Paper text:
Among the most extensively studied orphan receptors are the chicken ovalbumin upstream promoter-transcription factors ([name]-TFs), which belong to the NR2F subfamily. In mammals, the [name]-TF orphan NRs regulate many key biological processes, including angiogenesis, neuronal development, organogenesis, cell fate determination, metabolic homeostasis, and circadian rhythm. Here we demonstrate that [name]-[name] is a ligand-regulated nuclear receptor that can be activated by unphysiological micromolar concentrations of retinoic acids. [name]-TFs are the most evolutionarily conserved NRs among all species, and within the NR2F subfamily, the homology in both the DNA-binding domain (DBD) and ligand-binding domain (LBD) is extremely high.
Here we report the 1.48 Å crystal structure of the LBD of human [name]-[name]. The human [name]-[name] LBD was purified to homogeneity in a ligand-free state. There is one LBD molecule per asymmetric unit, but [name]-[name] forms a symmetric dimer through crystal packing. The structure contains 10 α helices that are folded into a typical three-layered helical sandwich seen in other NRs. The dimer interface is made up of residues involved in hydrophobic interactions and hydrogen bonding, with the majority of the hydrophobic interactions observed between residues found on the N-terminal half of helix α10 of each monomer, which forms a parallel coiled-coil structure in the crystal. In the absence of ligand, helix α10 bends at V373 and causes the C-terminal portion of α10 to collapse into the lower half of the receptor, the region where ligands have been found to bind in other NR LBDs. Due to the bulky size of these aromatic side chains and the dense pack of the binding pocket in [name]-[name], there is no room for any ligand to bind in this conformation. The kink in helix α10 and the subsequent collapse of the binding pocket of [name]-[name] allows the AF2 helix, which follows α10, to bind in the cofactor binding site of the LBD. The N-terminal end of AF2 is stabilized by a hydrogen bond between Q393 (AF2) and R246 (α4), and the C-terminal end of the AF2 is stabilized by hydrogen bonding between the conserved charge clamp residue R228 (α3) and two backbone carbonyl groups from residues M399 and L400 (AF2). In this orientation of the AF2 helix, neither coactivators nor corepressors are able to bind to [name]-[name], and therefore this structure represents an autorepressed form of this orphan NR.
Residue numbers in the entry: 171 to 193, 207 to 268, 286 to 407
The structure:
Amino acid sequence: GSNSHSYLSGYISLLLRAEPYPTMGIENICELAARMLFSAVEWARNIPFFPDLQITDQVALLRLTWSELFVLNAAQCSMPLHVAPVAFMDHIRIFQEQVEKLKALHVDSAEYSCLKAIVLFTSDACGLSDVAHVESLQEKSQCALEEYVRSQYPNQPTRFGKLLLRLPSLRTVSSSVIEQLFFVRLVGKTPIETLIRDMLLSGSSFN
């Protein structure tokens, strides 16, 4: 913005404000997973810029990234992870490290919200209509993150690069494993990527 430094800060505050949570019958692990997914989509509907993208671009971005946002939200919310002391466990084991590494870096709420924006605004999605604009938005998100981290963590000079190096691992987590682990009772069967568009068009608040 036109005081760049303060407007990058205002951005992060808006990314934060978009989060539904802080972010009787006690959620079970699969209800917890559905909330982590729905909250990703609701957060995306309420951040700056995303909702103004053409709808088909919004769908393309979420279809690719939902699993990475899912992982970010699962780490953020400390979703219980070894859990069924029933499960596989190659599946259980590979979701797990990524969560554990983000918690190990003590990623803060701000950093989570930036990382989710950087993940969402990816020009890797198939079928985008305005790739330059999405890139610009990712550049803004990364430039916001960099500024935050240099100012909040001035004695951890490598922190920015460590946070960015979480990204490739997100991109390798398998969508099918996440589905198999958490979403089968809810969905079968059906790949989440095929239901994302309905999800985005559902989903409540005026805010």
